[PDB]
Design a protein around this ligand. Structure first.
Ligand SMILES: [Mn+2]
Ligand SMILES: [Mn+2]
Ligand SMILES: [Mn+2]
Length: 430
DNA sequence: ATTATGACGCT
DNA sequence: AGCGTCATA
């Protein structure tokens, strides 16, 4: 009764850019705006690999992971922008710099957690309290929430989509108790007002549109964000969770999209997140371990405690390249040439990082894949990173992997390498 | 022959 | 430390 924690202590948002690499290319090239468009890496193998897709192109069935030649079969007029190539490899610098643009704007509203190149979580709890205090019992007008969906509404006793959005919002605001500064529903609502402001600033100052979710924790914020993409934000209330989760496939929840999620389904013989409520915490711990079990027990009730970390910068800087099929590296000088290419890009990015962010990486991780290995990385070794010098770093990387060569004579490399990866880690202030 | 990343958890 | 899992453009 008075003691069950309801996980409504925080207001958390997740802001995620719409079709992000496409928007970066569309800002740069106005000819691509309002068109079926995709961003592609490489070209020679089946037209290149698609890694981002405009919403116009999604209507034709184009997706990420698609080869551009196959995408062209679905959408003949699909426009394509190519990822930059430098030193023999895809180079994602334009998108990393566009990301920084957005992260720096978000950081004006609150401390953010960078969660990917195109999204960040925001803990808005403190900001909400302050916006509430200067509101002074003022109701929140629908005009302050022009792009907001309230999940689960309208409901109960118009066939257009913007009309439905407003009816839901009206029901939500009609039910609110703006008199209570400690009311979670009110706090989420004010949270949504702030996120409209944040999203407006992002679009105003970069030209990029985004979506967002507002809830009481990260997992619900992430889920909410996706519910009404693109260019809209969604509020998922604590009260909306039972209905939402009652038909929500388990795999849809962040962290459950892989093997653990499949095991929850198989072991418990269930399909939907809501079905998890019928197991005791000990039961879930018994199958999925102490941490996962407790996490699942709270999550299916809409409760999660993972904090929004104060980290705006990536904590690693890495360079990697696959060498598929018959391009696998089979000679020493080949291996060394590509270690140098990767190292030169790493040096460039590292030197820029040091000047911008007052830190130095101290560890170099070197990873390779060998032909005939199922897994993504075959071998991972670390060595000291003491100087931002590409030739030193590549020479060092070679030294850590020299012995992986199974060939008798030194000139050949066997079995051939299908992946090289250099990653700088363990930053210290400088 | 989706590729190029990046964070977190386990032992 | 090195490996595995999960995630995102
Ligand atoms: Mn996105
Ligand atoms: Mn994203
Ligand atoms: Mn995506």
């Amino acid at each position: 009764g008075p003691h069950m924690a309801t996980g409504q202590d925080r207001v958390v948002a997740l802001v995620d850019m719409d079709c992000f690499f496409v928007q970066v290319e569309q800002r740069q090239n106005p000819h691509l705006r309002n068109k079926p468009c995709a961003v592609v890496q490489y070209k020679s193998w089946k037209g290149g690999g698609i890694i981002a897709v405009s919403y116009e192109a999604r209507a034709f069935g184009v997706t990420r992971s698609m080869w551009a030649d196959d995408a062209k079969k679905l959408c003949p007029d699909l426009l394509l922008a190519q990822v930059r190539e430098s030193r023999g490899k895809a180079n994602l610098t334009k998108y990393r710099e566009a990301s920084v643009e957005v992260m720096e704007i978000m950081s004006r509203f609150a401390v953010i957690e960078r969660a990917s190149i195109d999204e960040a979580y925001v803990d808005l709890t403190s900001a909400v309290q302050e916006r509430l205090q200067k509101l002074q019992g003022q109701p929140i007008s629908a005009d302050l929430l022009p792009s907001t969906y309230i999940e689960g509404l309208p409901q109960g006793p118009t066939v257009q989509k913007e009309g439905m959005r407003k009816q839901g919002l009206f029901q939500w605001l009609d039910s609110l108790q703006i008199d209570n500064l400690t009311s979670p529903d009110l706090q989420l609502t004010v949270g949504a007002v702030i996120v409209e402001e944040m999203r407006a600033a992002i679009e105003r100052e970069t030209g990029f549109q985004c979506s967002a979710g507002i809830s009481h924790n990260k997992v619900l914020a992430k889920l909410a964000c996706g519910l009404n993409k693109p260019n809209r934000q969604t509020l998922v209330s604590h009260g909306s969770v039972p209905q939402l989760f009652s038909q929500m496939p388990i795999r849809k929840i962040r962290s459950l999209g892989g093997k653990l999620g499949a095991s929850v389904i198989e072991i418990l013989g269930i399909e939907y997140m809501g079905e998890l409520t019928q197991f005791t915490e000990s039961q879930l711990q018994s199958h999925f371990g102490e941490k996962n079990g407790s996490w699942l027990y709270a999550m299916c009730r809409g409760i999660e405690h993972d904090p929004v970390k104060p980290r705006q910068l990536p904590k690693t800087i890495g360079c990697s390249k696959n060498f598929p099929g018959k391009t696998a590296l089979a000679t020493r000088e080949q291996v060394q040439w590509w270690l140098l290419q990767l190292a030169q890009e790493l040096e460039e990015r590292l030197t820029k990082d040091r000047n911008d962010n007052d830190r130095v990486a101290t560890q170099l991780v070197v990873s390779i894949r060998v032909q005939g290995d199922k897994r993504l990385s075959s071998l991972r070794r670390c060595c000291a990173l003491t100087r931002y010098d590409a030739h030193k770093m590549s020479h060092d990387a070679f030294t850590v992997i020299k012995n992986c060569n199974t060939s008798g004579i030194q000139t050949e490399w066997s079995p051939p390498l299908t992946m090289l990866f250099l990653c700088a880690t363990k930053f210290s202030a400088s």
